[PDB]
């Protein structure tokens, strides 16, 4: 009935690091997340068949802090974060 | 070679899938992709329905999804996208 | 501190039996990675797709997620055209931001 801007993260990583991730989201004040499982992917590390994708809608001011919190991680582990623009009602 | 369109990401409990797809059909949506067996915290057995739709279906669709999400878990993310041949949509 | 850069993201939806055709196109174009979401269901112009119903799971619909520099979008769609004229499926092109362009281009 009224659309508001927001950001949406797609966070793709190895499932063994999921707790760390969802845990880190919680501390930034993210209010929810949905997780897509049993993925397969091709990367610099060359192949998988696992991996998960965490979808998180978050206010734009949280983007910075989250990317910063995930920095040390992706600099030592496989994975990627895609930042989207979205609207929610 | 690309035209503008909108893409919905509809996250909700699986028991309500038919309610959700009836809304898409009844509204004129020509197609949809369903991602299954999700997990979440968020109020996003969860599924995500991906629907590419002309912008002028967005209002009407959200209108139907409103009373539902006031009484049930879930969310709707609206995205901007481009496609090659909109007629298909 | 962390700068963001513009990029495009494809969602490619098609029958699983054509996965190799699709990924060959990505590899040839110079796409550096992709993520595949499996065992999907869908409604198309003609019929339902329910991979829970498939006998060989490598036959259900899949969605290929590919982050790609904008200048690969044209070429990729060009290859995906004749395919989608003769087969089920669709491509959605998204705008996105990433922290590390070099990982994608
Ligand atoms: N508007 C849409 N939004 C999301 N997914 C779609 C849409 N249209 C088609 N799809 C996906 O593509 C699949 C095949 O669609 P389509 O090519 O129209 O099939 P068919 O050849 O049987 O008409 C669908 O099952 C669905 O997953
Ligand atoms: N360009 C990309 N597009 C989509 N997914 C990607 C991309 N690059 C990496 N990924 C995902 O991230 C995983 C790890 O890649 P890497 O970080 O290179 O090890 C891959 O298996 C993919 O699932």
Short mmCIF file of C-alpha atoms and ligand atoms in Angstrom, two decimals:
data_model
loop_
_atom_site.label_atom_id
_atom_site.label_comp_id
_atom_site.label_asym_id
_atom_site.label_seq_id
_atom_site.Cartn_x
_atom_site.Cartn_y
_atom_site.Cartn_z
CA UNK A 1 0.00 0.00 0.00
CA UNK A 2 3.07 2.15 0.28
CA UNK A 3 6.49 1.13 -0.76
CA UNK A 4 9.65 1.79 1.26
CA UNK A 5 13.23 1.39 0.10
CA UNK A 6 15.45 -1.10 1.69
CA UNK A 7 18.50 -3.23 0.89
CA UNK A 8 18.68 -6.98 0.46
CA UNK A 9 21.80 -9.10 1.00
CA UNK A 10 22.53 -12.42 -0.63
CA UNK A 11 25.29 -14.04 1.42
CA UNK A 12 26.75 -17.19 -0.11
CA UNK A 13 29.03 -19.36 1.98
CA UNK A 14 29.91 -22.79 3.25
CA UNK A 15 27.32 -24.23 5.58
CA UNK A 16 29.75 -24.98 8.40
CA UNK A 17 30.03 -21.21 8.90
CA UNK A 18 26.32 -20.61 9.12
CA UNK A 19 26.16 -20.08 12.84
CA UNK A 20 28.79 -17.51 12.67
CA UNK A 21 26.85 -15.73 9.98
CA UNK A 22 23.37 -15.73 11.38
CA UNK A 23 25.00 -14.85 14.64
CA UNK A 24 26.68 -11.88 13.19
CA UNK A 25 23.45 -10.70 11.61
CA UNK A 26 21.67 -10.85 14.95
CA UNK A 27 24.25 -8.61 16.53
CA UNK A 28 23.86 -5.92 13.81
CA UNK A 29 20.13 -5.75 14.63
CA UNK A 30 18.89 -7.58 11.54
CA UNK A 31 15.36 -8.67 12.30
CA UNK A 32 15.14 -11.75 10.10
CA UNK A 33 16.80 -13.87 7.47
CA UNK A 34 15.87 -16.80 5.33
CA UNK A 35 18.24 -19.54 4.35
CA UNK A 36 18.47 -21.41 1.08
CA UNK A 37 20.15 -24.72 1.26
CA UNK A 38 21.87 -27.46 -0.59
CA UNK A 39 23.48 -25.31 -3.20
CA UNK A 40 26.22 -26.04 -5.72
CA UNK A 41 28.64 -23.45 -7.17
CA UNK A 42 31.70 -22.74 -9.16
CA UNK A 43 34.24 -20.40 -7.75
CA UNK A 44 37.91 -19.60 -7.59
CA UNK A 45 38.17 -22.66 -5.45
CA UNK A 46 36.65 -24.55 -8.36
CA UNK A 47 33.45 -26.57 -7.54
CA UNK A 48 30.82 -27.72 -5.02
CA UNK A 49 27.57 -29.74 -5.05
CA UNK A 50 27.70 -27.68 1.25
CA UNK A 51 27.00 -24.11 0.40
CA UNK A 52 24.07 -22.00 1.59
CA UNK A 53 22.65 -18.63 0.67
CA UNK A 54 21.41 -16.32 3.41
CA UNK A 55 18.83 -13.76 2.28
CA UNK A 56 18.60 -10.75 4.58
CA UNK A 57 16.47 -7.64 4.14
CA UNK A 58 18.14 -4.85 6.10
CA UNK A 59 17.96 -1.06 6.46
CA UNK A 60 20.64 0.63 4.38
CA UNK A 61 22.57 1.97 7.32
CA UNK A 62 23.27 -1.55 8.36
CA UNK A 63 24.96 -2.46 5.14
CA UNK A 64 28.28 -0.89 6.02
CA UNK A 65 28.64 -2.54 9.45
CA UNK A 66 27.60 -5.96 8.11
CA UNK A 67 30.11 -5.89 5.23
CA UNK A 68 32.73 -4.81 7.76
CA UNK A 69 31.86 -7.61 10.10
CA UNK A 70 32.07 -10.11 7.31
CA UNK A 71 35.27 -8.67 5.96
CA UNK A 72 37.78 -10.69 7.96
CA UNK A 73 35.82 -13.79 7.03
CA UNK A 74 35.58 -13.55 3.22
CA UNK A 75 39.17 -12.54 3.18
CA UNK A 76 40.00 -16.02 4.48
CA UNK A 77 37.08 -18.04 3.23
CA UNK A 78 35.05 -18.71 0.15
CA UNK A 79 31.98 -16.67 -0.51
CA UNK A 80 30.34 -13.57 -1.77
CA UNK A 81 27.87 -10.89 -0.76
CA UNK A 82 25.54 -9.28 -3.31
CA UNK A 83 23.77 -6.08 -2.21
CA UNK A 84 20.37 -5.40 -3.84
CA UNK A 85 17.97 -2.48 -3.83
CA UNK A 86 14.40 -3.49 -2.95
CA UNK A 87 11.07 -2.02 -1.83
CA UNK A 88 8.81 -3.42 0.83
CA UNK A 89 5.27 -2.54 1.64
CA UNK B 1 17.80 -5.12 -25.99
CA UNK B 2 16.36 -5.07 -22.43
CA UNK B 3 13.09 -3.88 -20.92
CA UNK B 4 12.15 -2.99 -17.35
CA UNK B 5 10.06 -5.29 -15.20
CA UNK B 6 9.56 -6.04 -11.50
CA UNK B 7 10.42 -9.20 -9.62
CA UNK B 8 8.74 -10.37 -6.41
CA UNK B 9 10.26 -12.59 -3.83
CA UNK B 10 7.42 -13.93 -1.72
CA UNK B 11 8.49 -15.75 1.40
CA UNK B 12 5.95 -17.71 3.47
CA UNK B 13 4.93 -21.02 4.99
CA UNK B 14 4.45 -23.84 2.56
CA UNK B 15 0.94 -24.73 3.74
CA UNK B 16 -0.21 -21.44 2.20
CA UNK B 17 1.34 -22.05 -1.22
CA UNK B 18 -2.01 -22.47 -2.99
CA UNK B 19 -3.41 -19.23 -1.52
CA UNK B 20 -0.31 -17.48 -2.80
CA UNK B 21 -0.26 -18.96 -6.31
CA UNK B 22 -4.03 -18.39 -6.72
CA UNK B 23 -3.34 -14.67 -6.18
CA UNK B 24 -0.63 -14.71 -8.84
CA UNK B 25 -2.87 -16.59 -11.28
CA UNK B 26 -5.98 -14.64 -10.50
CA UNK B 27 -4.01 -11.46 -11.05
CA UNK B 28 -2.66 -12.29 -14.44
CA UNK B 29 0.84 -13.30 -13.53
CA UNK B 30 2.08 -15.56 -16.28
CA UNK B 31 4.69 -17.52 -14.36
CA UNK B 32 6.48 -18.31 -11.12
CA UNK B 33 9.41 -20.24 -9.68
CA UNK B 34 9.31 -21.82 -6.23
CA UNK B 35 12.34 -22.36 -4.03
CA UNK B 36 11.60 -25.00 -1.42
CA UNK B 37 12.59 -26.29 2.03
CA UNK B 38 13.90 -22.99 3.41
CA UNK B 39 14.87 -22.05 6.95
CA UNK B 40 14.48 -18.75 8.68
CA UNK B 41 14.34 -16.64 11.77
CA UNK B 42 12.93 -13.27 10.93
CA UNK B 43 7.95 -13.27 10.07
CA UNK B 44 10.25 -14.78 7.43
CA UNK B 45 8.61 -25.13 6.44
CA UNK B 46 9.31 -22.11 4.31
CA UNK B 47 9.20 -21.46 0.61
CA UNK B 48 10.08 -18.55 -1.62
CA UNK B 49 8.00 -17.76 -4.69
CA UNK B 50 9.84 -15.84 -7.42
CA UNK B 51 7.52 -13.98 -9.77
CA UNK B 52 8.48 -11.67 -12.62
CA UNK B 53 5.54 -9.33 -13.21
CA UNK B 54 4.74 -6.10 -15.07
CA UNK B 55 4.93 -3.13 -12.75
CA UNK B 56 1.17 -2.55 -12.96
CA UNK B 57 0.50 -5.91 -11.28
CA UNK B 58 2.60 -4.95 -8.25
CA UNK B 59 -0.03 -2.78 -6.52
CA UNK B 60 -2.89 -5.30 -6.92
CA UNK B 61 -0.70 -8.23 -5.81
CA UNK B 62 0.51 -6.47 -2.64
CA UNK B 63 -3.10 -5.55 -1.90
CA UNK B 64 -4.03 -9.23 -1.73
CA UNK B 65 -0.90 -10.20 0.15
CA UNK B 66 -1.55 -7.58 2.86
CA UNK B 67 -4.34 -9.06 5.01
CA UNK B 68 -2.62 -12.41 4.65
CA UNK B 69 0.71 -11.17 6.03
CA UNK B 70 -1.11 -9.31 8.84
CA UNK B 71 -2.33 -12.69 10.03
CA UNK B 72 0.54 -14.93 8.87
CA UNK B 73 4.32 -15.18 8.72
CA UNK B 74 6.20 -13.85 5.72
CA UNK B 75 7.35 -10.95 3.55
CA UNK B 76 7.51 -9.69 -0.02
CA UNK B 77 10.60 -8.23 -1.63
CA UNK B 78 10.06 -6.16 -4.76
CA UNK B 79 12.91 -5.80 -7.18
CA UNK B 80 13.74 -3.95 -10.36
CA UNK B 81 14.92 -6.19 -13.21
CA UNK B 82 15.38 -6.23 -16.99
CA UNK B 83 14.24 -8.86 -19.45
CA UNK B 84 14.69 -9.32 -23.13
CA UNK B 85 11.15 -9.88 -24.26
CA UNK B 86 8.46 -8.72 -21.90
CA UNK B 87 5.58 -10.20 -23.86
CA UNK B 88 6.42 -13.37 -22.12
CA UNK B 89 5.42 -11.68 -18.94
CA UNK C 1 35.59 2.08 4.68
CA UNK C 2 34.37 -0.65 2.34
CA UNK C 3 33.58 0.74 -1.11
CA UNK C 4 30.83 -0.86 -3.18
CA UNK C 5 30.93 -1.23 -6.96
CA UNK C 6 28.12 -1.80 -9.52
CA UNK C 7 27.66 -5.17 -11.16
CA UNK C 8 24.85 -7.21 -12.72
CA UNK C 9 23.33 -10.43 -11.48
CA UNK C 10 21.58 -13.02 -13.66
CA UNK C 11 18.93 -15.45 -12.52
CA UNK C 12 18.73 -18.15 -15.19
CA UNK C 13 15.89 -20.62 -14.87
CA UNK C 14 15.75 -23.78 -17.00
CA UNK C 15 15.35 -27.53 -17.08
CA UNK C 16 18.15 -29.33 -15.29
CA UNK C 17 19.00 -31.51 -18.29
CA UNK C 18 20.35 -28.37 -19.96
CA UNK C 19 22.63 -27.35 -17.09
CA UNK C 20 25.85 -28.09 -18.98
CA UNK C 21 24.74 -26.05 -22.03
CA UNK C 22 24.05 -23.18 -19.68
CA UNK C 23 27.28 -23.33 -17.66
CA UNK C 24 29.37 -23.76 -20.84
CA UNK C 25 27.97 -20.40 -21.99
CA UNK C 26 28.94 -18.78 -18.68
CA UNK C 27 32.48 -20.29 -18.74
CA UNK C 28 33.03 -19.31 -22.35
CA UNK C 29 31.87 -15.71 -21.74
CA UNK C 30 34.47 -15.35 -18.96
CA UNK C 31 32.05 -15.55 -16.04
CA UNK C 32 34.15 -16.33 -12.99
CA UNK C 33 31.59 -18.16 -10.90
CA UNK C 34 27.98 -19.17 -10.39
CA UNK C 35 25.64 -20.64 -7.83
CA UNK C 36 22.99 -23.23 -8.63
CA UNK C 37 19.71 -23.58 -6.77
CA UNK C 38 18.27 -27.03 -7.35
CA UNK C 39 15.03 -29.05 -7.37
CA UNK C 40 12.67 -26.16 -8.16
CA UNK C 41 9.01 -26.11 -9.14
CA UNK C 42 7.34 -23.59 -11.41
CA UNK C 43 4.47 -22.66 -13.57
CA UNK C 44 5.10 -21.82 -17.15
CA UNK C 45 3.12 -21.08 -20.25
CA UNK C 46 2.41 -24.69 -20.69
CA UNK C 47 2.37 -26.78 -17.55
CA UNK C 48 3.79 -27.28 -14.10
CA UNK C 49 7.27 -28.33 -13.26
CA UNK C 50 7.63 -30.19 -10.06
CA UNK C 51 10.99 -31.74 -9.60
CA UNK C 52 9.91 -33.48 -6.47
CA UNK C 53 8.11 -35.59 -9.13
CA UNK C 54 11.22 -36.14 -11.24
CA UNK C 55 12.87 -39.53 -11.46
CA UNK C 56 16.36 -38.25 -12.08
CA UNK C 57 16.82 -35.27 -9.90
CA UNK C 58 19.18 -33.74 -12.47
CA UNK C 59 16.03 -33.23 -14.49
CA UNK C 60 14.05 -30.81 -12.22
CA UNK C 61 14.13 -27.05 -12.92
CA UNK C 62 17.19 -25.21 -11.61
CA UNK C 63 18.14 -21.59 -11.13
CA UNK C 64 21.65 -20.45 -11.96
CA UNK C 65 22.79 -17.30 -10.14
CA UNK C 66 25.63 -15.51 -11.88
CA UNK C 67 27.24 -12.21 -10.90
CA UNK C 68 28.81 -10.75 -14.04
CA UNK C 69 30.28 -7.45 -15.28
CA UNK C 70 27.71 -5.48 -17.23
CA UNK C 71 29.64 -5.96 -20.49
CA UNK C 72 29.06 -9.73 -20.34
CA UNK C 73 25.28 -9.28 -20.19
CA UNK C 74 24.74 -8.64 -23.92
CA UNK C 75 26.88 -11.58 -25.10
CA UNK C 76 25.33 -13.96 -22.55
CA UNK C 77 21.74 -13.09 -23.52
CA UNK C 78 22.72 -13.52 -27.16
CA UNK C 79 23.62 -17.16 -26.50
CA UNK C 80 20.64 -17.77 -24.27
CA UNK C 81 18.20 -16.49 -26.94
CA UNK C 82 17.96 -19.32 -29.49
CA UNK C 83 17.97 -21.72 -26.56
CA UNK C 84 14.96 -20.12 -24.86
CA UNK C 85 13.14 -19.90 -28.23
CA UNK C 86 13.26 -23.67 -28.33
CA UNK C 87 13.22 -24.50 -24.61
CA UNK C 88 11.53 -23.60 -21.32
CA UNK C 89 12.98 -20.89 -19.12
CA UNK C 90 13.79 -17.24 -18.43
CA UNK C 91 16.56 -14.80 -17.51
CA UNK C 92 16.13 -11.97 -15.00
CA UNK C 93 18.84 -9.27 -15.00
CA UNK C 94 19.43 -7.50 -11.65
CA UNK C 95 21.49 -4.52 -10.57
CA UNK C 96 23.72 -5.26 -7.57
CA UNK C 97 26.74 -3.91 -5.68
CA UNK C 98 29.82 -5.91 -4.64
CA UNK C 99 32.89 -5.26 -2.51
CA UNK C 100 35.43 -6.84 -4.83
CA UNK C 101 35.13 -6.22 -8.62
CA UNK C 102 38.32 -8.22 -9.25
CA UNK C 103 36.61 -11.36 -8.03
CA UNK C 104 34.03 -11.08 -10.73
CA UNK C 105 35.84 -9.38 -13.63
N1 LIG D 1 7.02 -14.85 -14.73
C1 LIG D 1 7.82 -15.79 -14.23
N2 LIG D 1 8.37 -15.67 -13.04
C2 LIG D 1 9.16 -16.58 -12.52
N3 LIG D 1 9.46 -17.69 -13.13
C3 LIG D 1 8.96 -17.97 -14.34
C4 LIG D 1 8.10 -17.01 -14.98
N4 LIG D 1 7.77 -17.52 -16.14
C5 LIG D 1 8.36 -18.69 -16.26
N5 LIG D 1 9.07 -18.96 -15.18
C6 LIG D 1 9.88 -20.14 -14.93
O1 LIG D 1 10.24 -20.80 -16.11
C7 LIG D 1 9.67 -22.07 -16.19
C8 LIG D 1 9.26 -22.40 -17.60
O2 LIG D 1 8.50 -21.36 -18.13
P1 LIG D 1 8.07 -21.37 -19.63
O3 LIG D 1 9.30 -21.25 -20.41
O4 LIG D 1 7.04 -20.34 -19.78
O5 LIG D 1 7.52 -22.87 -19.77
P2 LIG D 1 6.62 -23.54 -20.94
O6 LIG D 1 7.51 -23.67 -22.11
O7 LIG D 1 6.11 -24.81 -20.40
O8 LIG D 1 5.55 -22.54 -21.25
C9 LIG D 1 8.53 -22.00 -15.23
O9 LIG D 1 8.22 -23.26 -14.70
C10 LIG D 1 9.02 -21.07 -14.17
O10 LIG D 1 9.83 -21.66 -13.20
N1 LIG D 2 30.13 -14.66 -9.89
C1 LIG D 2 29.44 -15.43 -9.09
N2 LIG D 2 28.17 -15.58 -9.28
C2 LIG D 2 27.46 -16.34 -8.52
N3 LIG D 2 27.93 -17.02 -7.52
C3 LIG D 2 29.20 -16.99 -7.20
C4 LIG D 2 30.05 -16.17 -8.00
N4 LIG D 2 31.23 -16.29 -7.51
C5 LIG D 2 31.17 -17.12 -6.52
N5 LIG D 2 29.96 -17.54 -6.30
C6 LIG D 2 29.60 -18.49 -5.24
O1 LIG D 2 30.57 -18.48 -4.23
C7 LIG D 2 31.16 -19.74 -4.09
C8 LIG D 2 32.61 -19.68 -3.72
O2 LIG D 2 33.40 -18.98 -4.64
P1 LIG D 2 34.79 -18.46 -4.22
O3 LIG D 2 34.52 -17.45 -3.28
O4 LIG D 2 35.39 -18.02 -5.43
O5 LIG D 2 35.37 -19.60 -3.60
C9 LIG D 2 30.91 -20.45 -5.39
O6 LIG D 2 30.85 -21.83 -5.26
C10 LIG D 2 29.60 -19.88 -5.80
O7 LIG D 2 28.53 -20.60 -5.26
#
